[PDB]
């Protein structure tokens, strides 16, 4: 059983704090600790044991045990397992000690739980509203199961935005350069405040969650089990198969569900095919701010032949719908599989020539070095997970630590650079394109065979687990608890860029105005995945 050593270390460091512990799967572990001793346990597992704060979230278990539940998912990466730290916040006085003064990665999860559930982490410095809009009435906490109906819409208190932006390094003489929410080539709402002195950015604050639909509440009220796979696809058009596989594996880990052999690694094939689509889009956007546009339209061309295998492996463009809880909906056939193999190869042909642009190295040496540097010291604290943390030096990858859809039968390579520039994050994505093309080269020629679907099973109530996938921008951790045979009790999703966002203040600092859209797009944000 994985995770015994960390539990023993927690027991010897803290003798009588672990009130209860249980195993979800072999590599999944949860512990219930004391409420007043919570920040020491998570800080210990974070700093001393080398754990990364993946996701933390609240729960409404007042009719299950009479208490709120705040979970703290930690990824052990020094074998490698999942540890969740659970606390039982009191009902009529919801207050638990905060982790943000100890672990900086707990700054927005503890701001989200102030809004969705109304729980109060005492000692949290950033007390501003995060997810709910500025016109939201105060005490309506949406994710409380008895606060309001999902269909209720309060009257907007204000038409103007009342958000407060902090200026850490600037003063009352600095000007601001908005870059949202309605900006061209941003293609997605998100506000930015560049506190500039000239063209240099002194400080940078931002307002997000303009695309907060509220699908966490809607996934547990109006919508079932097989239908949330459609909700996960319609979050963003480019992580659709990442969210669906992350949600599906959360529900199949919550029960047994011994999925058939080829239905695992076909999901591994389509997970990598999607990162051909998303990385080559970012590399096209990397050339549209570096300068050349005949490097963009051409990355659009190699993106189209990545869309051509996505046309034949599924038959759809963007949002799809190919996974169910037991297995995959539509199934690949022989010629599709022989064909995808050399269109993978001709892309490796085309990708090599198009990557000869950085070999050219003129705006790819002066515009993309020393710009938007992310400190690996900072990236370790805030627990970034995408190509950000792989460029900064940490070999953080879900497919190597935790093979979820049969990646152990596929050739896995983790690429980590040393520089922390924009050009370093492009080199992460360039080596990931060849890596994903090696898996398409080695996946579709040796399928194990067998069935595709496992259905007819009954959902055991109040069973939960963690589901994870390797999205193109990092990992998405999906935690879902089964409610009954039809509905979910609670489904929580954290986007790949949700962990990535709180370090944009430390990238845009010291840079210029002109390359500031390049710094934001260097990590390839998916606002719709993080805004939920």
Residues in contact with ligand FCO by CB under 6 A are 236, 239, 242-243, 471-473, 476, 495-497, 526, 529-530
| Structure token pair of residue 453 | 């679907």
Could you tell me the smallest distance in angstroms from the CB atom of residue 184 to another protein? 9
The interface partner of residue 472, options being Ni ion, another protein, ligand FCO, none and the CB cut-off 5 to 8 Å by kind, is: ligand FCO
φ, ψ for residue 490, nearest 5 deg: -160, 135
Sign of CA dihedral 250, 253, 256, 257: positive
Task: Verify binding: residue 178, another protein, rule CB under 8 A.
Answer: yes
Nearer Cβ to another protein, position 155 or 182? 182
Coil, strand or helix: which one is 137?
Answer: coil
Q: Residue 303's binding partner, choosing from ligand FCO, Ni ion, another protein, none, with beta-carbon cut-off 5 to 8 A by kind?
A: none
Question: Does residue 517 interact with another protein by CB under 8 A?
Answer: no
Q: How far is CA 70 from the centre of its chain?
A: 19
Could you tell me the smallest distance in angstroms from the CB atom of residue 432 to ligand FCO? 12
Of residues 132-161, which lie at the interface with another protein (CB under 8 A)? 160-161
Confirm or reject binding of residue 169 to another protein (CB under 8 A): no
- Binding site partner of 530, from another protein, ligand FCO, Ni ion, none, Cβ cut-off 5-8 A by kind: ligand FCO
Q: Which helix (H) or strand (E) holds 51?
A: strand 51-57
Query: For residues 376 and 358, what is the distance between their CA atoms, to the nearest angstrom?
Result: 24
DSSP run (H or E) holding 20:
strand 20-23
129 binds another protein (CB under 8 A): no
* Peptide bond connecting 181 to the previous residue in cis, omega within 30 degrees of 0: yes
CB of 429 to ligand FCO, least distance (A): 12
Neighbours of 123 (CB within 10 A): 13
Spatial distance between the Cα atoms of 434 and 416, rounded to a whole number of angstroms: 14
Q: Which does 181 bind (CB under 5 to 8 A by kind): another protein, Ni ion, ligand FCO, none?
A: another protein
Q: Is 359 in the site for another protein (CB under 8 A)?
A: no
Question: How many other CB atoms sit within 10 Å of the CB of residue 392?
Answer: 26
Minimum separation from the CB atom of position 193 to another protein (A): 9
Rounded Cα–Cα distance for residues 288 and 52 (Å): 34
Calpha distance 490→247 (Å, rounded): 12
Residue (30 or 497) nearer to ligand FCO, CB: 497
**Residue 278 Cβ vs ligand FCO, minimum distance, rounded to whole Å:** 6
- 89 close to 12: Cβ distance less than 8 angstroms: no
Whole-number CA gyration radius for the chain: 23
Closest CA to 42 of 119, 155, 112, 121: 121
Q: With CB under 8 A, what is the number of residues at the site for another protein?
A: 19
Whose Cβ is closer to Ni ion: residue 402's or residue 532's?
532
Question: Which residues on adjacent β-strands are paired with residue 68?
Answer: 60, 89
208 binds Ni ion (CB under 5 A): no
Closer residue to another protein, CB minimum distance, 366 or 486 = 366
Residue numbers preceding breaks in the chain (C to N > 2.5 A) = 78
Q: Which residue is closest to ligand FCO by CB?
A: 239
CA–CA distance, 149 with 214 (Å, rounded to integer): 12
Please pick, from the candidates 36, 79, 157, 175, the single residue that binds another protein as defined by CB under 8 A: 175
Whether the CB-CB separation of 385 and 242 falls below 8 Å is answered with: no
Q: Is 526 in the site for Ni ion (CB under 5 A)?
A: yes
Q: Which parts of 215-244 interact with Ni ion (CB under 5 A)?
A: 236, 239
Contact 43, 104 (CB under 8 A): no
**Does 304 help bind another protein (rule: CB under 8 A)?**
no
212 or 243, CB closer to ligand FCO? 243
What's the token pair of residue 456?
């007819």
Q: Which of 55, 56, 76, 179 binds another protein (CB under 8 A)?
A: 179
Query: Minimal distance in Å, beta carbon 64 to ligand FCO?
Result: 29
101 binds another protein (CB under 8 A): no
The answer to whether 199 contacts another protein (rule: CB under 8 A) is yes
Residues that bind another protein in the complex, under the rule CB under 8 A? 160-161, 172-176, 178-183, 189, 191, 196-199
Residues that bind Ni ion in the complex, under the rule CB under 5 A? 236, 239, 526, 529
């Amino acid at each position: 059983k994985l995770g015994q050593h960390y539990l023993a270390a927690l027991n010897e460091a803290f003798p009588g704090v672990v009130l209860d512990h249980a195993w979800q799967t072999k590599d999944q572990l949860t512990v219930t600790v004391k409420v007043n001793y919570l920040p020491e346990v998570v800080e210990f597992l974070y700093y001393k044991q080398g754990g990364w704060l993946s996701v933390l979230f609240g729960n409404d278990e007042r009719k299950l045990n009479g208490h709120y539940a705040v979970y703290y998912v930690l990824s052990m990466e020094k074998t490698k397992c999942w540890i969740t730290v659970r606390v039982e916040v009191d009902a009529n006085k919801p207050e638990y000690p905060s982790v943000t003064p100890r672990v900086p990665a707990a700054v927005w999860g503890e701001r989200e739980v102030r809004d969705m559930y109304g729980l109060i982490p005492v000692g949290l410095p950033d007390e501003r509203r995060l997810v709910l809009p500025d016109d939201w009435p105060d005490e309506l906490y949406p994710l409380r199961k008895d606060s309001m109906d999902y269909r209720q819409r309060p009257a907007p208190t204000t038409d103007a935005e009342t958000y407060e932006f902090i200026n850490e390094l600037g003063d009352k003489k600095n000007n601001v350069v908005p870059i949202g929410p309605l900006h061209v080539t941003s293609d997605e709402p998100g506000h930015f405040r560049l506190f500039v002195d000239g063209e240099n950015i002194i400080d940078a604050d931002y307002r997000l969650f303009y695309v907060h639909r509220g699908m966490e509440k809607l996934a547990e009220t109006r919508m079932g089990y097989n239908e949330v796979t459609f909700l996960s696809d319609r979050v963003c058009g480019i992580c659709g198969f990442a969210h669906s596989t992350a949600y599906t594996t959360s529900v199949e880990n919550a029960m047994g569900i011994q999925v058939p052999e080829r239905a695992q690694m076909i999901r591994a094939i389509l997970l990598e095919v999607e990162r051909l689509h998303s990385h080559l889009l970012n590399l096209g956007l990397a050339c549209h701010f570096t300068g050349f546009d005949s490097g963009f339209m051409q990355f659009f061309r190699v993106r189209e032949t990545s869309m051509k295998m996505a046309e034949i492996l599924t038959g759809a463009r963007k949002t799809y719908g190919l996974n169910l809880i037991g297995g995959i909906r539509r199934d690949l056939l022989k010629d599709d599989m022989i064909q995808t193999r050399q269109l993978a190869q001709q892309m490796r042909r085309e990708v090599q020539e198009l990557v000869d642009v950085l070999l050219s190295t003129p705006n790819m040496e002066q515009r993309t070095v020393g710009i938007g540097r992310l400190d690996p010291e900072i990236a370790r604290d805030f627990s970034n997970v995408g190509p950000m943390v792989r460029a900064s030096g940490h070999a953080r990858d879900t497919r190597a630590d935790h093979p979820f859809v049969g990646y152990g039968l596929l050739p896995m390579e983790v690429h980590s650079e040393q520089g922390c520039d924009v050009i370093s994050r492009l080199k992460v994505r360039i080596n990931e394109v060849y890596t994903a093309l090696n898996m398409i080269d080695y996946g579709l020629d040796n399928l194990p065979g067998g069935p595709l679907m496992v259905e007819g099973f009954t959902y055991i109530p109040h069973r939960f687990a963690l589901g994870f996938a390797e999205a193109p921008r990092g990992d998405d951790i999906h935690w879902s608890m089964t409610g009954d045979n039809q509905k979910l009790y609670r489904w929580r999703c954290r986007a790949a860029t949700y962990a990535n966002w709180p370090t944009l203040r430390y990238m845009l600092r010291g840079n210029t105005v002109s390359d500031a859209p390049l710094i934001i797009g260097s990590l390839d944000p998916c606002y719709s995945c993080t805004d939920r």
